[PDB]
């Protein structure tokens, strides 16, 4: 099993949630959302990681994540690009994430992993699941043992992503927790709860979700997570995968 | 809410199972298989329909007739454009149209005109919203016992993907949605995973090929059905779809 | 490998031929007029021609909403086209079609794309010892078409053709993978390109036909009516295809 | 029409060629390959742009290529590439397919006021290039081109939807066809290149090796492509 932000991530461990809005709106709104999500997960005993990307400038957005981390007292995650200053971001956030469109940029992935922080590596929509083993293997090649593989859908014809549930099983061969992006593999909102239930019933380590105060409304998050936690318990009771 | 073979089928009703071997091998094997599935399904409170396809055509019909009478179960089979419907319809309880015929409206209506329940399989070349048109014309003449069966959609060459959104969309037909768990991969390791996913999304019935290639072994059926029944209880508990 | 068909030769190295016509037979008058028009146009371009028409669409419709003549009346109209206009005629056959009746009238049988995996039925069609245009299902990979074609040819029918019509690309979309035109040459049969169904959006019909002809094919299949191509634009299109076909044959390394 | 490295690019203009090795291997090898490709294109009267990708040492070889061989040079740029340094050396910038949806990066590249070959991602629908190109031209760069490289088709397969070559004419830009990556299987490169040329394109993009086409088979292939291009231009009603 893998350690991450003070809790354990794994197929046999309790499901965790990466959630937050897409982009940082206001310090006031970001702190309200982060606190609301923290309490909801606390009332459901779900380990929680806050996420939001940069609207406000890069430096100002970094401060809002600094204030969320310190005032709300939650771990924070954000994306990085090939031109992101890794040391400045790493001195603020707890989890780095590589976007799907960079998943084949091996050396950028290696630069990200070299920061010695947990990395959520998003599978590209142009990738077959078995190809993730090599992407993940290159990320771990210098000792970073905190890599995760994030499923976000695969291209299906034009302007359509399909969630191939086999990918959740195949990517267990990476030796990493598999995270399911429930709000991006739709990119049409009424399918988000259905697909999240499917992924959790198949068996995953964590959920990734965008929330709205292709997003799931904040006032509907607790009911959905309540149904997902019950589905997760059923998977673990009958699991023959561990 | 639809009635079928002495039980009711629906998203809010207990999950039912259509299962059996691909083709009828021997009368001895058919009675053993049908009897085995009957005892297992009865002990798990799962309404059960035995299925098998075409052993000469005349000989196969009596074997299904002997299964129906000796084992005491409803029986299902497919028919083609050249199947003598009255002869087949006078033996079996449920007709099924193969996926490659789903666009042959003239043939679908002839099948539905037998006034038996019909399991209409969606073609791998069909979008889910197209089943509304297939089912509507199938029901146009009063047959209120039509079901929609998902079996996967083409994904590039030599690959089927199970788009779980189809299970939600086809609810708009007003018919039970059946999930073919053994053809959506046609690769055996994913059968339980994909069955768990579909049941968690919410379906009316399961369709499974079982033998003691893309078949599930008979001696592993009960453990699998146990996990699917638990996932089905979780779906109905939190469902907002009924 | 050389193949004869309706009095002419079909092949990657042979002149391009055309299967064309309306989807369904409307009237005897309309079928004879259309067939006669295409016959003169193809003769004046030196393009071997086969007229095609069915009594119902490829996906047969409910009788409660069916527009057209009977199976029997449609068969008679094709006989008069063959006889009055003097052209070879092609039509579809389904699993419930009387093959001997259709075979005694038409020159070329055609199996629809949705039946390509029905080996039993394909073998019965090939047993008629007539030319067969076997359409590739949108759910088939090109290498699977070799097995479909091979089983049809396994007992000596030397007039089998492979017809490409596009493959499923996500929902409600067909893509024309030009690689299949190359792969299916390995069946040892003429490859025919369905230019009006590979889109099933009309703007692309001439473009996709040019592409297929430049890749190298044996024949063209086209739906034309006055995703059908209009009858009064067929000649300009065919003229540009012949120029692209000559260029393909001049530099070809495939034969 | 559009000007590019001293020649005109367009559906109605003669076909041009971007060609070269994937990455700079040797200074010696780059000069030989660029010289070989330059000679071949002259014997066929085909406008030619040399391409290879990389940082300081690789950038230096491409200038010696530009100066010794006397050909225009093209190279890729990434989000962290210093654009001004590369732009002061090469003649044409190229954005890789995986960056096409990074709108702000596309504009930073186009702001160099050099011609730019924007590769369509394998995950993009053709009609989406209209939006990508519009943002690229938004600050006046009238030297943008759209490069087709295939679209994802299931797992581990790229298919060339020839319709995209027609659709992308609506961007108002020359459409370039990548004949050596739309496969990513080597026997199909000439077949697919012929098809794209018969559909009608502005230029060819090709990876060469002394999923690449051998350098000693380039001339026979290009000879057949120029003939197909002439036939397309003779009957074209698209311009």
UniProtKB/Swiss-Prot annotation, chain A:
Chief localisation class: cytoplasm
Family, per entry: Belongs to the KdsA family.
Protein name: 2-dehydro-3-deoxyphosphooctonate aldolase
GO molecular function, one term: 3-deoxy-8-phosphooctulonate synthase activity
Keywords: Cytoplasm, Lipopolysaccharide biosynthesis, Transferase
Cross-referenced InterPro entries: Aldolase_TIM, DAHP1/KDSA, KDO8P_synthase
Localization annotation: Cytoplasm
Alphabetized HAMAP family for the sequence: KDO8P_synth
Catalytic reactions of this protein: D-arabinose 5-phosphate + phosphoenolpyruvate + H2O = 3-deoxy-alpha-D-manno-2-octulosonate-8-phosphate + phosphate
Pathway named in the protein's UniProt entry: Carbohydrate biosynthesis; 3-deoxy-D-manno-octulosonate biosynthesis; 3-deoxy-D-manno-octulosonate from D-ribulose 5-phosphate: step 2/3; Bacterial outer membrane biogenesis; lipopolysaccharide biosynthesis
Name of the encoding gene: kdsA
GO cellular component: cytoplasm
PANTHER family reported in the protein's UniProt record: PHOSPHO-2-DEHYDRO-3-DEOXYHEPTONATE ALDOLASE
BP GO annotations: keto-3-deoxy-D-manno-octulosonic acid biosynthetic process
EC numbers for this chain: 2.5.1.55
UniProtKB/Swiss-Prot annotation, chain D:
Pathway named in the protein's UniProt entry: Carbohydrate biosynthesis; 3-deoxy-D-manno-octulosonate biosynthesis; 3-deoxy-D-manno-octulosonate from D-ribulose 5-phosphate: step 2/3; Bacterial outer membrane biogenesis; lipopolysaccharide biosynthesis
Gene Ontology biological process: keto-3-deoxy-D-manno-octulosonic acid biosynthetic process
Source organism per UniProt: Legionella pneumophila subsp. pneumophila (strain Philadelphia 1 / ATCC 33152 / DSM 7513)
KW Coiled coil (keyword) present: no
EC number: 2.5.1.55
NCBIfam families for the chain: KDO8P_synth, PRK05198.1
Gene (UniProt): kdsA
Location of the protein in the cell: Cytoplasm
Covalent S-S links between cysteines: none
Name assigned to this protein: 2-dehydro-3-deoxyphosphooctonate aldolase
Name of a matching Pfam family: DAHP_synth_1
GO molecular function: 3-deoxy-8-phosphooctulonate synthase activity
Reactions it catalyzes: D-arabinose 5-phosphate + phosphoenolpyruvate + H2O = 3-deoxy-alpha-D-manno-2-octulosonate-8-phosphate + phosphate
Cited InterPro entries: Aldolase_TIM, DAHP1/KDSA, KDO8P_synthase
GO CC annotation terms, alphabetical: cytoplasm
Enzyme class per UniProt: transferase
KW Heme (keyword) present: no
């Amino acid at each position: 099993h893998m350690r991450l932000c003070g809790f354990e991530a794994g197929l046999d461990k309790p499901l965790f949630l990466i959630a937050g809005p897409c982009v940082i709106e206001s310090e006031e709104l970001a702190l309200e959302t982060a606190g609301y999500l923290k309490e909801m997960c606390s009332q459901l005993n779900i380990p929680f990681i806050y996420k939001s990307s940069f609207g406000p400038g890069f430096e100002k957005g970094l401060s809002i994540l600094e204030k969320v981390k310190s005032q709300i007292g939650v771990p924070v995650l954000t994306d990085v690009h090939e031109d992101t200053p890794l040391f400045e971001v790493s001195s603020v956030v707890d989890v780095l994430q590589t976007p799907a469109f960079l998943c084949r940029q091996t050396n950028f992935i290696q630069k990200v992993a070299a920061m010695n922080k947990p990395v959520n590596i998003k599978k590209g929509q142009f990738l077959a699941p078995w190809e993730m083993k090599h992407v993940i293997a290159k990320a771990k090649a210098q000792g970073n043992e905190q890599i995760m593989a994030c499923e976000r859908g695969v291209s299906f014809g034009y302007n359509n992503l399909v969630s191939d549930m086999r990918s959740l099983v195949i990517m267990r061969e990476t030796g990493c927790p598999v995270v399911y992006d429930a709000t991006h593999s739709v990119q049409q909102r009424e399918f988000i709860p259905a697909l999240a239930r499917a992924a959790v019933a198949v068996g995953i380590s964590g959920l990734f979700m965008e929330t709205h105060p292709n997003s799931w409304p904040l006032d509907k998050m607790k009911q959905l997570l309540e149904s997902l936690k019950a589905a997760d318990e059923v998977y673990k009771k009958y699991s023959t995968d561990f």
